[PDB]
Amino acid sequence: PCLTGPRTCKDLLDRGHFLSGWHTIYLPDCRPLTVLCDMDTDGGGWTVFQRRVDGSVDFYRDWATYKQGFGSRLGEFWLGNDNIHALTAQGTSELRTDLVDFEDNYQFAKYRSFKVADEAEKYNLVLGAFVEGSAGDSLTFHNNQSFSTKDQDNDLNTGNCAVMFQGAWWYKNCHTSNLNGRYLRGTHGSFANGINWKSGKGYNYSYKVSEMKVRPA
Amino acid sequence: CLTGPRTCKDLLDRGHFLSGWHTIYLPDCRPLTVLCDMDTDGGGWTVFQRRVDGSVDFYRDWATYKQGFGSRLGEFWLGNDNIHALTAQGTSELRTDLVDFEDNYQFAKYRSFKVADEAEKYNLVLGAFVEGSAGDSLTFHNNQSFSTKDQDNDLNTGNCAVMFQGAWWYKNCHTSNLNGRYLRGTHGSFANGINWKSGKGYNYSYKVSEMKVRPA
Amino acid sequence: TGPRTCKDLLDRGHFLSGWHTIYLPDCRPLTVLCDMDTDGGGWTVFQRRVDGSVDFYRDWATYKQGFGSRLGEFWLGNDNIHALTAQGTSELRTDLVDFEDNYQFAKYRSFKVADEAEKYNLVLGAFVEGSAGDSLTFHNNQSFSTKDQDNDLNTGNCAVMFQGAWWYKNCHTSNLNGRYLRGTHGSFANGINWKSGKGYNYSYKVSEMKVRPA
Ligand SMILES: *[C@@H]1O[C@H](CO)[C@@H](O[C@@H]2O[C@H](CO)[C@@H](O[C@@H]3O[C@H](CO)[C@@H](O)[C@H](O)[C@@H]3O)[C@H](O)[C@H]2NC(C)=O)[C@H](O)[C@H]1NC(C)=O
Ligand SMILES: CC(=O)OCC[N+](C)(C)C
Ligand SMILES: CC(=O)OCC[N+](C)(C)C
Ligand SMILES: CC(=O)OCC[N+](C)(C)C
Ligand SMILES: [Ca+2]
Ligand SMILES: [Ca+2]
Ligand SMILES: [Ca+2]
């Protein structure tokens, strides 16, 4: 009953589910997990692990919360670090980042591979090559970095990157990207604490939509 | 049934951490797709009422409140038969969540909450106010049949549901009216909005409202 | 056996609109959107525009298999729409909203689309009623045209001029798969347009196309 069923969003597309939405796939350890499949963007078949859309969900959360995931299938959410690792351990998944502004401009960025280690390794980020994408690289800077929340500081910054830029991320010292920052709605005066992608709209603009998704590379 | 999930609390305990529509099995093993709020106040809440944008007409008749109405994609009332079925084993709390148009949030938690069957006209059986920023505006409605425009069971020589375009355990008539008209903030009209008297009062209609239960 | 249509589901006490799985006459599952509210309820919805978030200017293979998101806009796909209609008599119905929240509709006694061999050909009954007027009878007995597949009768490219897919003739009175232009637009007839409704220069806020047994 675990071997009958699907294991990625790509499988489901291959089996003729053409509509984006929440489907259940089976983890490599046979745990069933209800994921969001984007069956439309760039060929379709993407499993979506992060999604901001309207600012309705608090993303300024603690380690246990980022661990297990939070939010709503009906809106915004983080799939959870255990799940993101589970999905990306064994094998090779490409990463697509899709973004939108409040002026309705669509941007993206695409990476060759994407993997996060387990909690023992603080969900460490293993990033392949920037392939292309009109949003430009603002993730490579964050390669080989542990992931930090406000209540657990694993960055290379003598202070707390998560309290400062008000998010949660593979911070370094601190970031060129902050997709789990505060939903600030466009141009903001405050520094780099919005849904920010430095090479995109920069440190003072917070996107309307953001999605981070994976697909078997 | 029986092994599977009985409540939204079960589903959380079993590792569904994301809010959303899941199917649970009632005290009678009838399968029921409900909305689980896996986030608020510990999570594990089954949500039976939701206003969010004003897209759904709530000024409806008895048969409609009976069976429920609305959309999983937005606003809805789970239906009185279902709400009764859900709280029959009268040991589950009520939380009322409310958001204004400046994103200021408020709430009100009650220690038990139960509605009788249609025979007893979905009478409201409410426990104690425990805590909450909304102030308490539900108690006043304890031990009262539920009325809709076409089924007048209030203590008011007229038709309360008509006079406040809603449906409720109306007395004479109300201090709370969460099924009233989606009036969008301050309104001139009297007490016919999504109103909670002790909250923002008789002339302010909230942006969001949710009524949810969980086993104590 | 189980759920053949959204009407079945309503008859079984699913009163809330939303995505349910039903069983096509071949017995293939399909998760469809049920509108359990409008005009008695029990409608299976095969098209929906709501906010302009999804690109509808797509190619034949894409309209074939469907595209979009259960969370928003989408086209159920022509194979599914054919599967969905052909076997029985389903009764089309269109719901249009303009930006001043004015509501209009049209209803048709029957609605069917042929298979891909016949170019998903539109086979349409008579106008029952509709305050939107009738901007679709005009399109009866016409193959589907995508920007990349031209089967229209303007030897120019209808789909390209107006950017959308439809059973185009020479060219259109309705264009519900056109560009989400947000109300009044200067460009000609390339929005979400229904000619007898708010005409060739207004693009609705919402549009839905849904079917139900007669
Ligand atoms: C991820 O970051 C870690 C730090 O947490 C990086 O580890 C460091 O890697 C350098 C070389 O890249 C190591 O230097 C080597 O070791 C000896 C010193 O004992 C030196 O003499 C050798 O010549 C060699 O340079 C360094 O020791 C090491 N630091 C730590 C803290 O272990 C690691 O390289 C990063 N991983 C990737 C794939 O980038
Ligand atoms: C930080 C965060 O995730 O919010 C919850 C705080 N808690 C669990 C201590 C009440
Ligand atoms: C008021 C309301 O809930 O609508 C139902 C009335 N009827 C009979 C037209 C369906
Ligand atoms: C709109 C709705 O579902 O209730 C009225 C019933 N109708 C329209 C079939 C008479
Ligand atoms: Ca530090
Ligand atoms: Ca009375
Ligand atoms: Ca031509």
Question: Are A155 and A130 in the same domain?
Answer: no
Tell me chain A's radius of gyration from C-alpha atoms: 16
Which listed ligand is nearest to C15 at the C-alpha? 4
Residue A167: name the closest of A62, A77, A73 by CA.
A62
Nearest residue (CA) to ligand 4, atom 5? C40
Q: Is C69 annotated as a binding residue?
A: no
Alpha carbons C58 and C80: distance in angstroms, whole number: 17
Question: Are C60 and C153 in the same domain?
Answer: no
Question: Are A68 and A37 in the same domain?
Answer: yes
Question: Are C109 and C39 in the same domain?
Answer: yes
Which listed ligand is nearest to C143 at the C-alpha? 7
Do the chains contact at B68 and C18, CB–CB below 8 Å? no
Give, for B110, the enclosing helix (H) or strand (E): strand B105-110
Task: With H, G, I as helix, E, B as strand and everything else as coil, classify residue C81.
Answer: helix
Alpha carbons A2 and A167: distance in angstroms, whole number: 36
Question: Nearest CA to CA, how far is A69 from chain B (Å)?
Answer: 6
Alpha carbons C114 and C84: distance in angstroms, whole number: 11
Question: Does B179 contact ligand 3 (Cβ within 6 A)?
Answer: no
| Resolution of the experimental model, in Å, one decimal | 2.8
Task: With H, G, I as helix, E, B as strand and everything else as coil, classify residue C23.
Answer: strand
Please say whether the beta carbons of A124 and A117 come within 8 A: yes
Question: Are B125 and B164 in the same domain?
Answer: no
Place of tokens 């980042």: A97
Q: What is the DSSP string of chain A?
A: --SSS--SHHHHHHTT--SBEEEEEE-TTS-EEEEEEE-SGGGS-EEEEEEESSS-S-----HHHHHH-EEBTTS-EE--HHHHHHHHSSS-EEEEEEEE-TT--EEEEEES-EEE--GGGTT-EEE--EEE-TT---SGGGTT---BBTTB--SSSSS-HHHHTTS-BS-SSS-SB-TTSB---EE-SSSS-BS-BTTTTBTTEE-SEEEEEEEE-
Do the chains contact at C18 and B72, CB–CB below 8 Å? yes
Token readout for B122 is: 């979905």
Question: Are B186 and B203 in the same domain?
Answer: yes
Give, for C45, the enclosing helix (H) or strand (E): strand C43-49
Alpha carbons C35 and C7: distance in angstroms, whole number: 9
Please report which residue ranges of chain B form alpha helices under DSSP H: 8-13, 62-67, 80-87, 160-163
Alpha carbons C172 and C157: distance in angstroms, whole number: 12
Alpha carbons A18 and C106: distance in angstroms, whole number: 28
Cα–Cα distances (Å) from C154 to A84, C58, C123, C147, C150, in that order, read 51, 20, 20, 13, 9
Give, for B148, the enclosing helix (H) or strand (E): none
Chains touching C, CB cut-off 8 Å, 3+ pairs: A, B
- Beta-bridged to residue C106, according to DSSP, are C94
Alpha carbons B149 and B179: distance in angstroms, whole number: 12
Question: Are A202 and A213 in the same domain?
Answer: no
Question: Nearest CA to CA, how far is C36 from chain B (Å)?
Answer: 8
Of A16, A19, A104, the CB nearest to C70: A19
Preceding omega of C171 cis (within 30 degrees of 0): yes
Long-range contacts of C100-109 (CB under 8 A, 24+ apart): C101/C205, C104/C130, C104/C131, C104/C132, C104/C133, C104/C194, C104/C197, C104/C198, C105/C130, C105/C131, C105/C132, C106/C130, C106/C132, C106/C133, C106/C134, C106/C135, C106/C136, C106/C194, C107/C39, C108/C136, C109/C214
Question: Are B16 and B99 in the same domain?
Answer: yes
Question: Are C40 and C97 in the same domain?
Answer: yes
Please report which residue ranges of chain C form alpha helices under DSSP H: 6-11, 60-65, 78-86, 158-162
Please say whether the beta carbons of C182 and C78 come within 8 A: no
Q: Is C150 annotated as a binding residue?
A: yes
CA of C149 to the centre of ligand 7 (A): 9
Indicate which CATH number applies to the domain containing C152: 4.10.530.10
Question: Are B126 and B173 in the same domain?
Answer: no
Token readout for C162 is: 């107006």
The residue segments making up the domain with residue A39 are 1-135+209-217
The annotated binding site of B for a carbohydrate is made up of 144-145
Q: Which residue of C has its CA nearest to B73?
A: C18
Question: Are B51 and B100 in the same domain?
Answer: yes
Question: Nearest CA to CA, how far is C180 from chain A (Å)?
Answer: 12
Please state how this structure was obtained.
X-ray
Nearest residue (CA) to ligand 4, atom 3? C40
Report the Cα C87 to chain-centroid distance in Å: 18
**Quick one: which atom of ligand 3 is closest to the CA of B60?**
3
Indicate which CATH number applies to the domain containing A69: 3.90.215.10
